[PDB]
Amino acid sequence: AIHRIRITLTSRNVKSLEKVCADLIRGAKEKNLKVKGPVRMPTKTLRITTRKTPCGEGSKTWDRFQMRIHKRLIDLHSPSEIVKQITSISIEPGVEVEVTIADA
Amino acid sequence: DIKLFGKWSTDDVQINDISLQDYIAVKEKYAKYLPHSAGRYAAKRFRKAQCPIVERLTNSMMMHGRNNGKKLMTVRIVKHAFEIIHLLTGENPLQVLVNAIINSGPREDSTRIGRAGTVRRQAVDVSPLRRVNQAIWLLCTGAREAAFRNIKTIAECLADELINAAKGSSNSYAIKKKDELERVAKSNR
Amino acid sequence: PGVTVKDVNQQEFVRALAAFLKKSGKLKVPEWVDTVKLAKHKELAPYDENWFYTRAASTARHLYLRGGAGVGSMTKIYGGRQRNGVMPSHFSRGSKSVARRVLQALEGLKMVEKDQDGGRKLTPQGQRDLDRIAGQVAAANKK
Amino acid sequence: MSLVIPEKFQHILRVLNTNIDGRRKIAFAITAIKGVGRRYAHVVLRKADIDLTKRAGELTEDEVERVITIMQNPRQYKIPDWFLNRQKDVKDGKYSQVLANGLDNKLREDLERLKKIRAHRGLRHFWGLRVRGQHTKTTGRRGRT
Amino acid sequence: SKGPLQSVQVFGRKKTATAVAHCKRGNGLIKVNGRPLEMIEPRTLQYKLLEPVLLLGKERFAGVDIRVRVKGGGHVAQIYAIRQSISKALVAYYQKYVDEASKKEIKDILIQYDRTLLVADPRRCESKKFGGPGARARYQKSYR
Amino acid sequence: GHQQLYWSHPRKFGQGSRSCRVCSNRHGLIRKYGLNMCRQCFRQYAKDIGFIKLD
Amino acid sequence: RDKLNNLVLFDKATYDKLCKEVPNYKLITPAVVSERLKIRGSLARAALQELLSKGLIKLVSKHRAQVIYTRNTKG
Amino acid sequence: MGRVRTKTVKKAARVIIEKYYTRLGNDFHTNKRVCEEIAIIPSKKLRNKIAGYVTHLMKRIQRGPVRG
Amino acid sequence: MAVQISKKRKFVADGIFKAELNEFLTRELAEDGYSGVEVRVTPTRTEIIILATRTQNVLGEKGRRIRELTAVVQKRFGFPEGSVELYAEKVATRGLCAIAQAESLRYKLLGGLAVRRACYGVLRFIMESGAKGCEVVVSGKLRGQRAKSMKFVDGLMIHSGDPVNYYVDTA
RNA sequence: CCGAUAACGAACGAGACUCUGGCAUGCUAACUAGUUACGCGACCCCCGAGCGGUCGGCGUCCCCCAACUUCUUAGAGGGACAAGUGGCGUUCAGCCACCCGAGAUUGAGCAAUAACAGGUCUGUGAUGCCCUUAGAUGUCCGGGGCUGCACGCGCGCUACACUGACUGGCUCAGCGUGUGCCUACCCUACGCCGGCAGGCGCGGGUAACCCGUUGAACCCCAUUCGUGAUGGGGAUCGGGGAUUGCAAUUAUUCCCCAUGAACGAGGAAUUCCCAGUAAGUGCGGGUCAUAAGCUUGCGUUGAUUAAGUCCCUGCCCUUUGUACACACCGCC
């Protein structure tokens, strides 16, 4: 077994996040594990504003850099065991995956 | 039926001259319960014409740095001023305000660029919208320097400014400046 | 027609609660109520003499509105604008000892009890007292 | 309460060695005494048990001498220790509020003590410059020219 | 008699201040955050709060239980959010559970009294730029 | 001299305790998000870290 | 326009001056009472609430920054 | 003011009109619905702007012999 | 938990690792036609792929040099042993890689070819490999002491907007 | 852009593009977001209501032991195009007004050829040449200095008060950060002591889980003050108490009590700005062992005026004159 697991996927780009969150759940449906819906957490916007010039001479122009971090949560819940059933991950570079259980 | 501030029905107020009856907005289509409405009246030209003049007075009464967002304070100032003028005169505060606007709007001014005769080269009559704008600005300014450094509060100062303007007594800064402008324009004719 | 505290204006309500707390005086009033300022950012002591009762009434009303508020939370409510003189103004918090002593006097009157977790809330009979005073002030305002 | 002016209403008083305006409120009239401010005046009136909503000119002799006594000797009337000006005096280490030109001569003796020991703060006081580390480059010009 | 499941939940916005009115069949009452409508902190805007009620009449409000929750913005933004939310909740209730005849001959009064009672104000803010204190003003410049 | 005075001056804090992780500079560091990189070096490498410009 | 040296407490000359025509004109505010009786203004507020207690002046506004009074109706 | 169309939309509109004059119509939505399969438009804004110009040019065509 | 750092710092550290590894590979494999580095990180292990033109040159005698670099990247960042694998991949259409062409131009200039002929050759090779356009700018102490800049551009070249990011490769 | 047309065919820039804000009761999804309903409760009314009212009290993803996504979040999609109507127009390119509409001009980012002896060699293990290199211009350690003051200037903060100050009560945000490779230094709930600054124990949080429902300020409601250099202003200055550090004097910062100085709206001059804008107002980040009058962002309140012109300062195109070409700061 009686297990209930949580898989969180985080990266910088929505295209790869969406395709992972799609193919994983489609594999789950084809492998008849009932799926708790994908929860899209609020985006983390890392902002850094820095003076453009390396000198301090100029018109005081500031360059602003952003890093968008998006994360999704999918809860895999089955009456039987889960980890022995699902072993493949099919994870491309860029996206980071973390799997916990209900105890953690 | 609308009863601005809960009283002072609008339907009895009459504008005495047709020059400003398309720019004063006290009639029942523009009668509002309270002079506060985020109506986007500055989005397009001539949109302030259909803005109620009590709203205009509230917006122009909040000036000089300390008071640029204190619209609730300005609304309470206008309410107290209407109470005071009603007690002092007995007629409609809206009627007093309309008469003050009419008597404060300067019918002509002077404007040019080149070698000035007295103030400007040419004497030019003004638009009704400019009449209303100048009248409201003059009334608020007169109330402000009336209330600046004396014990008499801003409510009474605005009240007696409108009272003096609605009749014409040379005791109000609005019509004093109006007469000065008229004399300058007449000299610049 | 039952009356709760949310159906009456909180200003004269807290005034009436302070008056009741004054007339039925069983508080643990500290010895420094005549000297201390109510906050770091204030520059004079409160004008009213029995300000402690008004403050305790306000704390009871706030605890009714939301429970589990500790001393730091109450200082967050009673914080204000510190003018800082020539420097630009900022925000300051209330007096921690004042809030603590008000709360301790409240559980001395046993209308406030600590939670299972941190902070303290109102007891059922404290809620009863608040509602009764709300009803009587509603009646006074009506007729 | 809102009566006529009382018969024994002196317009200014004589407290210690300075006069105070009796036209203003009592809580702010004795603030004209050097060494007394809004907080000190309020606390001494509170512990003197005098109505704060009355002017200083309408007080009586017993009330004013009670104020005198409490101002002169705050320690024995439950004025807390941390509230006084000359706390932990450099000469005798005794906690005392100072109320009059005693404050002026105490400032004088402390400044001349600093000058005598030739400390940097005392030398700055002698030269008329800032003593709290402020920048003297761009400000303080009026005091010199 | 005892017809259940008669409720709508309609929101209104004014400067990121959202207000959700839960209109429901019952006796006529309107409450905001558990407090009476006529009793709010900026009582100057009590007329703005009561404006839909004064326009439409207590009879159309006599059959509705409305509870409004606000969790954003400032004070007057809250007030405008509540009035818009109440108006939109009433027109949604009249559009769903009774005829659009009544819906239209209340919506017209609402519109040609105040368009903002039923249409949200899109203007929110504007980002500050790195040349001045605000969105458009610039820091004072000097030449000598 | 010996070990007792060569590096004895404390640098557990302050600007001298921090240096750029790239160029060992001690001015214009960015410690936000544990970056520990110079102001100029961050502009140099922001494409590589992933900080890209949007507005 | 130099100074006002306004009275802080009433006297015999101004007490009856207050009592016999202040509840006779249309506008009674502490500011106008102060400026036409040459008194301070806290005195004006206190006198006006005393006359409220006596009941010969009708309050209309009662606002924290602008309080307005009037005389009683005739007829 | 500032609603002048550019070559990118004008040339594309003329080309698709001369190619699919039978399928096109005077309805803006119908034209913007034929555009996605008669042409590859990288942007929705570009697609609908081209569709609007197609409506204008077809009104002009049905009222007279436009150079297209 | 307490042992793992937050997501913000973790992503920033990943970017720092990518940048440091890329700078190291640029300064080390410069003469071997270095083009780029791609890291595929998994909790089990990580794979570093070096896109370079001369794979047989970046791989030393029986992989001695790739083993050396694998050990270096092992020791510098302190991975668990046997948890990182380094592969070398030959790029496709090396004329389209601005990094490789800039490195080749630098190699030619260091060899001593005339800058005019070398830049013409680089441009011709890029357009022969097939691109919508190319632009090479050489700045510095050309000819005399006074510095000059020569720009050789042909074909199409956009400069503004978003599509420059994924259409123009700049080195 | 339409059009003419010794040009035809192109290329860059502009536009297109990306992000952002506004509408989606349409779709997907939510115990790290909630709503509705129901059940335990706690309180008021109990005259009698009782499917009465309040609850940020406890529960119903504790797994069978409710549903749903309106509110919040974030993805895929839609939506706006001068599309429709009237007028003007060579009846073209387009412009004006209006209807319906969330929106009929949301703000940014990117940004051409050619240049400047514009700024940085004090960002770099970017760097040529020159200088120094053991009594060092390397490097380390101690102390001082970068703050130093007859004076002038620039960016700012605080004010000159009653549209206010004080005192108390009531009541509302959104950006965004938070425990470290070196590297020691995180955000803090709650309880207790102290008047305050602070201190002492218990926890939570590597985070839509905790701070935090970010109880912010302004504002609102009552009190005192009363036209005075006054309860405006808080500079200067004395004494005392804590905090950081290895160290606080030339005061790091903070707290308390005293002193209330100029300042009563500012000459000649001059800056910025067109709608959620200016301005008032606070709150985050950077700097940070200690810390913001700075800067970069965020939210709250919210206007006056204008929909024009080339008059001043400039910019673009065409014609024109030139003795200028380092180009009118020219030449003579």
Ligand SMILES: [Mg+2]
């Ligand atoms: Mg562009």
Ligand SMILES: [Mg+2]
């Ligand atoms: Mg004071």
